[PDB]
Structure formats: C-alpha cells, structure tokens
Ligand binder design. Structure first.
Ligand code: HEM
Ligand code: HEM
Lengths: 362, 362
C-alpha cells in the first residue's frame, strides 16, 4: 500500500504542525481538502507554511545533531517550481550564495519537488554541494579519500580534475526522464575557502591546509507528512572538530597529524608523549582561529555542547520528549568535558526527519 | 526456581570450560558428579581449575574493558577457605600487596566463598580496596565526591578522616551472621601512591596532585557456571585517561582543569582557545610521566587501543564471537585517533561475567 501510508502520516503531521503554529481550528477543513486531493490526485501538496515548519521540525528531530538550538531559525527556500537542469543549477548556486552570506553563514534548506509515485523529479548525487575530490592511483593518494567513488562517477561523464588535494568537485544531478546525470563546475567566486594558520606558530602555514567554508549536505531525504523530498540540500555552520579532528586528522581522510606534530616541533616517537593528542589540540585551535580571522562563522565543541544543553532544557519546557544519539553527539575531542558525555539519550526516530537514501553511483 | 537455573548454567559452563582446557572427555563424569551434588547439597563446588579459568573467561567477556588482551594471564588467588573477619582482612591485604608487586602491577583476583542459598558469606562494601574519601560540609567540598556515600557510611561506624583531599578510606565488609560490617584501616606501607609532576613544566607540582597506584574493583559480582561469587575483588593496571581525564578532570570529581590551565600558563578566558583541551593533554602527559618515573605500570590510550585491536584479531582467530561496549571502550581523550571509535561492537552479555550488584549502604 501507499495511499494508506500517506493519509496516515498526513493526519498526524498536520495535527502536530498546526498545533505548534496556533491554528488548531484550521486542522478540520485542511484535512478534508487533503482527503479529496489524495483520492483525486493520489497525493497532496504542502503550503509554504506547512513545508517551512516541517523542515524546521525535521531539524529538531535530528538525533545526531548537536546544534538543534537554532531549529526555529531555519531559512527555508521553496523551489518546488523547478523544471529544467538550468533551474536546478541556478537554485544550488543561489543556495550556496545566500547560505554563505559573505561569511555570516545562514542555516538554510532548498526544497525541490518531492517524489510522485516513487519516481524522483530531481536527483542530487553530491554528498555536499561543496566538497573536494578524491583520487588513488595504483601509486599513492591525492585528495579526500571519502570522495573516491563520486569522483570516479564524475570522471565517467567527462569531468576531469587537476588532481590537487583540493579540487572542487562539480555539481552533479539527474532530472526525471534523463537516463544519466549532468554536471556543472562551481564558479570559484561562489565558494569561500579558508587557509589554515595558527595564532602562535608561524610554521603552521607550511602545511598548506585549507577547507571550504560551508557544509551543505545534499544526499539526504526529508520526510514531512508522508511526502518524500528526496532532494532538499541543507546547511548549518561548521563545528571546529568536524574539520580539525576528523576531515584533516582521520587516517582514512587527510591524515595530517604526523605533519602537524612536526611543524609544532614535537616528537612522534612515543605514544606516552601523547603527541597525537597534542597535535589535535593545536590543529583544532588553528582551525577555529583561521575561520574567525576570515570572518566565516564557526563554533567550538564547548560552546556547541553548551548550546545543545540549552536546547535540552527548552525541549522540556515546551513539553516535547527529547531524542539523541550519544555516539554522534559527543565531540571527537574532549567528550568528557561536555555534559553530553555524562548523560544518556533516547535514540528514537520521530518524523518529520532526514534519512539516509541509497547512493545512485556505486 | 533455583535448582533448575543452576544445573542449566553448570552444564553450559563445564562444557565450554573443558573444551578450552582440552578435557572434553572428562565432561561426562564431572557432570554426573555435579548432578549428585546439586541434588545432594543443593549446589556444587568448583575445582581450582574451573574457577581459575572461569575468572579468566569472565574477564574476556567484559564488554566495557579495553584491556582484555591479557585475559589469559590473570592471577587467580583462591581464598574460598576464609571463615573469620581477620581472614578476610589478611586476604585483602595480601591481594593489595601481591597485586601491587612493587610497581610491576599484576592482574589478579581473590576468589572468596560464593553465596549459598542467596545469602552472602562475605560482603565487601568498598568500590575499590584503595580509594580516597569524599566530604561535603554545608560549606565546600573536600576529597573525592564519588566517595561521598560510602564515607558517610564509614563515619557511622566509628571511622573518622583527617579531612584532606586524599584520605585513604578503610577496608569495610560484613561477615554472614553479623548485622553490621566492620572496618580496618589500611597500613600505609601497603599503599603505593604517585605524586603528579610534568616532564617540562616545573610549576606543575604546586597543584600537589597524587593518585593511588592500583585500582582494585571490589563491589562486582562474578558469575561462573551458575555460582555467584559476590565477593571477588580484581585488578589490572591503570590507563592514563582514567586518572588524568576523569578522576582529576571531571567537574563532579576533582575538577582540576582551571588550575592546570593556570600552572601551564594559559588563559581560561575563551572556549575558542581550547584551554580545557590543552589542559587535559598536559595533565594526561604528566600522569603517564609520573607513574613511569616511579616504576608503577600504566598504559596510554594509544597503546591500549592498539592492544585491544590485537585482542579482536585473536578472538576471531580462535573462533569466538566478540562483544564490546563502544561508549566505554573509546578513551575520553582523542577517541577518533584509536580504531575503536571507527568500528562497532555487539553489546551482548555472555556468562561467565562480572555484574553490578546493589550497594549495601545507600
Ligand atoms: C547551526 C549549525 C549546525 C551545527 C553547529 C550542526 C552541527 C552538526 C554536527 C556536529 C553534526 C555531526 C556530523 C558528523 O559527525 O558527521 C551534525 C549532524 C546532523 N545535522 Fe546538524 N548542525 C547544524 C545545522 C543543521 C541544519 C541546518 C540541519 C538541517 C535542517 C541539520 C541536520 C543534521 C542531520 C540530519 C545530521 C545527521 C548527519 C548525518 O548523519 O549525515 N543540522 N550537525
Ligand atoms: C590489564 C589491565 C587492564 C586495563 C588496562 C583495563 C582497563 C579498563 C578500562 C579503561 C576500563 C574502563 C573503566 C571506566 O571507564 O570506568 C575497564 C573496565 C572493566 N574492566 Fe578492565 N582493565 C584491565 C584489567 C581488568 C581485569 C584484571 C579485569 C577482571 C578480571 C577487568 C574487568 C573489567 C570490567 C568488568 C570492567 C567494567 C567496569 C565497570 O563497569 O565498573 N579488567 N577496564
């Protein structure tokens, strides 16, 4: 069944949604109208309000997210009107632009058309609109290993990277009707990057490290009232450790710890020296310092956790049960220094929410 | 039922145990003998071999433990012969002694008599044989907050601390038949302590930090073949972060981070400086350095995780399924630098094992 599943979800969503918006009386007629539409067309269409809030509710229900305090300030851009590839390209460009906001990043989400009878109207391949390529010749590795398969997929369609450690992959999506996707390179004037330097250590720039300024997840599905928005790229700002303790530090990512240990002048001879731990704190300090120097929003794990704590409180004050995933909520650097580590969370899925979906490539 | 539960467990344990020891043929007669005994006495008695190995199997099945690589080298001290309070005192003293082994700590466990008809023969109150007291006057806090309730309990029986931050609590247990427990102060010549200093920073000793040299958990129950050893204190060596990132760093424990940040000469003004993170790495480095300076065994989280990895491998080579608890396996400092962080574990309880039991005080 599908006509049953939908109408069920719809009644639940519209009820909770209007309850929060203060339009409990309008639940009656709206649900009558949706009933006709589901039987008439075989689905329904959300209003700019239902969807905007639905996107905000899905944010608040994101267990694995430490920054849900600002759920209610999401900038929902409604682009369910797109019909061509140029329309999609221009919307992603706009999204990157307005979201970046010259450095003062703005949490935003672009809502593209949802699936009709299970068939997607638009299909975004990218994990994040802005991301570096990854290559691994029979010899060694160049770039972000995490991007390996998507990079392969793009080179299969005519795209070719210069092969540096920081090649910006192109935008890649498929439109309903097209068998294969299309790609568009990102105008470099749209993409803000940040070179990594250290406040006290002058040698740190020899590492020639840098990272893009805005993470825009683009491969997740957004479920709201039974409607599946398979394409709805969203973004918040970065949390220092995502770049300094994972992207640049993981052995399966960039793996910069030995290098960092060297430029900061410490030995990588013994584990008892805790050099990896000392290197992580200098790299993480460098990352927070650079983004701040350049005027691009970022947050350290202490402020974030502290902000998350205030969320937990607000959720109780409003009467909503709280859900969270401890294994992803704790920062990868000094978890036991934040309150998140010491308490527990109910890892229960509540819709509306964002879900993983199967990669088209691979 | 209880006679049924026992015989069930017994058949399973003896089978797996002898299989590992290479005495599969002896499983027959031994199980016949245990059958008589269970119906004759209403329980059975393990052999020095069954119990020794049972204690080692329970170690290997400890999900929350990162050091199971040395499960097979446990030093099982059989003291199921104790009958008086002096017998128990002398056994705990001996345990502390032989286990400490002048600094070259030895993983050990003292097996006391198990429960008969649910009634304990010996009941140990202490969480760890060696541990500091905790006090909180209407005014401020002195000592280890974690010890607050046990300390209260001891002062209720005549014990009185000098009230420093590091008062060694006394040994406290109850013998079957006695209504209230008894206490015995620990001879200070038995207890090894380690003052905390830093390899490069001379000011670090102004903090006047120290920690005992051996953690001996004494409030856990050991289940082997249906038999419940409620009193069986065990110990391994320390892993630096247990002292440097938790005991001395937690806000509900000692809370030394602001102080450490000061002696190392860094500001505690902004979170973006990552001072807590910088302080944790200096304190953790200091702890590993001091214990090593004094010749008391200790292991850093990198070597430990690396040692745990080898365990995972061995468990697969031997054909045993592996169980683990990720939320306790990852070190509290730089978890994403160890392989444990990046994989997952089956948190399934397999007996023989160690279990929590209800505190007599409280
Ligand atoms: C205010 C800025 C934000 C901060 C500081 C923040 C931070 C984080 C962090 C640290 C994670 C962990 C990701 C990882 O470990 O890989 C995460 C995950 C997540 N966040 Fe947020 N976030 C922000 C905004 C948002 C927004 C705008 C949305 C959606 C409308 C959102 C949805 C999610 C979801 C669904 C995940 C799961 C990611 C996954 O499993 O792939 N977050 N976020
Ligand atoms: C080789 C030395 C050992 C090391 C390095 C080691 C390390 C650890 C660590 C780091 C934990 C975490 C404790 C916490 O986070 O509070 C732990 C837990 C545990 N270990 Fe081990 N361990 C060692 C020996 C042993 C021995 C000898 C036994 C028993 C025969 C054992 C039984 C357990 C159990 C049951 C836990 C659970 C503790 C609890 O939940 O209270 N370990 N160990």
């Amino acid at each position: 069944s599908h006509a049953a599943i939908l109408w069920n979800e719809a009644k639940a969503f519209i009820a909770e949604c209007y309850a929060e918006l203060g339009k409990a009386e309008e639940v009656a007629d709206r649900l009558d109208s949706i009933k006709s539409e589901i039987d008439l067309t075989g689905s329904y269409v959300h209003t700019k309000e239902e969807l905007e809030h639905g996107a905000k509710m899905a944010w608040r229900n994101s267990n694995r997210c430490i920054g849900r305090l600002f759920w209610n300030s999401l900038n929902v851009i409604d682009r369910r009107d797109v019909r061509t590839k140029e329309d999609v390209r221009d919307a992603l460009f706009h999204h990157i632009e307005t979201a970046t906001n010259n450095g003062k990043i703005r949490p935003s989400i672009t809502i593209f058309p949802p699936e009709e009878k299970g068939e997607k109207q638009v299909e975004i391949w990218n994990h994040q609109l802005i991301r570096y390529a990854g290559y691994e010749a029979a010899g060694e590795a160049i770039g972000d290993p995490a991007s390996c398969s998507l990079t392969a997929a793009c080179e299969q369609l005519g795209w070719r990277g210069e092969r540096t450690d920081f090649d910006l992959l192109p935008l890649i999506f498929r439109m309903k009707g097209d068998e294969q996707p299309v790609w568009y390179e990102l105008p470099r004037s749209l993409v803000i990057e940040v070179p990594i330097t250290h406040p006290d250590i002058e040698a740190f720039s020899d590492l020639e490290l840098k990272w893009y300024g805005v993470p825009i997840i683009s491969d997740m599905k957004l479920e709201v009232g039974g409607i599946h928005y398979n394409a709805a790229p969203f973004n918040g700002w970065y949390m220092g450790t995502e770049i300094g303790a994972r992207n640049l530090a993981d052995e399966k990512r960039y793996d910069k710890l030995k290098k960092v240990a060297s430029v900061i002048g410490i030995s990588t001879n013994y584990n008892t020296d805790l050099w990896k731990d000392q290197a992580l704190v200098e790299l993480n300090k460098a990352v927070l310092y650079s983004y701040k120097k350049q005027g691009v929003s970022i947050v350290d794990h202490h402020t974030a956790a502290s902000q998350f704590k205030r969320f937990e409180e607000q959720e109780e004050e409003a009467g909503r049960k709280l859900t969270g995933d401890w294994t992803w909520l704790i920062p990868p650097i000094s978890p036991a220094a934040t309150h998140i580590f010491h308490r527990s969370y109910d890892n229960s899925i509540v819709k509306p929410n964002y879900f993983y979906q199967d990669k088209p490539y691979e």
